[model samples]
Target: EYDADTRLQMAENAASARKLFVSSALKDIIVNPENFYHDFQQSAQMAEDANQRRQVSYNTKREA
Candidate 1:
């Protein structure tokens, strides 16, 4: 069987491509980024791991 997880991931990726680069681009073109860090984080626990290249580590705060 094919890696249906990759297919699902690609689907989700495609659906969000238009929004993906907005963060970095906005940083480059308009706003300065708040923080930038690279850490060798380890996995904590198994959370239904899918065998696809997971998307970028983009994070945002919730609107209050």
Candidate 2:
């Protein structure tokens, strides 16, 4: 069993921490977005590769 008030406070604290982290990250990204874009470019390539792989896998199963 848990105390309701304590749990509520815990959840609120976690939300505040998350908000702080996100705001900090956004600020960093805004200040030097080139670094962020480098990582994002790699992620975008991976997504494109996965999309092509899945398309090929499904394309073979369909009749023209």
Candidate 3:
């Protein structure tokens, strides 16, 4: 329903908001590096576990 200009403006606004949020998040991480490392480790562990689960699920024999 939005015109071309209106849609472009909306996209610009969304990009601006995302930039601001990422800047703020980086600032927080810099202020508390220990917490950031803890979160990073947990996130990495979770990603590895998810990949392992996906691999196992795919490697299992399919039922006939």
Candidate 4:
């Protein structure tokens, strides 16, 4: 399931940030359908915010 991929990505991100291990608690959350759905929504919102900011910055640079 997509949950596994999300967990892998999150684990890698945590590791890159110097977290030695992903929490079993978080894995529990990831495996549950409701939690997974909420997490996906949160991720989507974060991506949208990032993309919006990026576009705004690009436009600002173009104007400058």
Best by lDDT: 4
Off by over 4 Å in 1: 19-64
lDDT of 1 at 59: 46
lDDT scores in order: 0.43, 0.62, 0.63, 0.71
Models ranked on TM-score: 3, 4, 2, 1
What is the per-residue lDDT of model 3 for residues 1-64, given as tens digits with 9 covering 90 to 100? Answer: 5664565556557768777333455444444444334665587798998999999998997898
The TM-score values for the models, in the order shown, are 0.25, 0.30, 0.32, 0.31
Model 2: per-residue lDDT, tens digit, 1-39?
346455455655776877833355544444445433466
Candidate 2, residue 56: CA error in Å? Answer: 0.4
* lDDT, candidate 1, 24-58, per-residue tens: 44434333334444333335323223222143223
Taking all chains together, the TM-score of candidate 1 against the true structure is 0.25
Candidate 3, superposed: residue stretches over 4 Å from native: 1-41, 62-64
Which residue pairs show backbone clashes in model 2?
none
Give the distance in Å from residue 24's predicted Cα in candidate 3 to where it truly belongs.
Answer: 27
Model 4: per-residue Cα lDDT over 39-64, one tens digit each: 65587799998999999987775634
Model 1 accuracy (lDDT, Cα): 0.43
| Error at 18, model 3, angstroms | 24
Give the Cα-based TM-score of candidate 4 against the true structure.
0.31
lDDT computed for candidate 2? 0.62
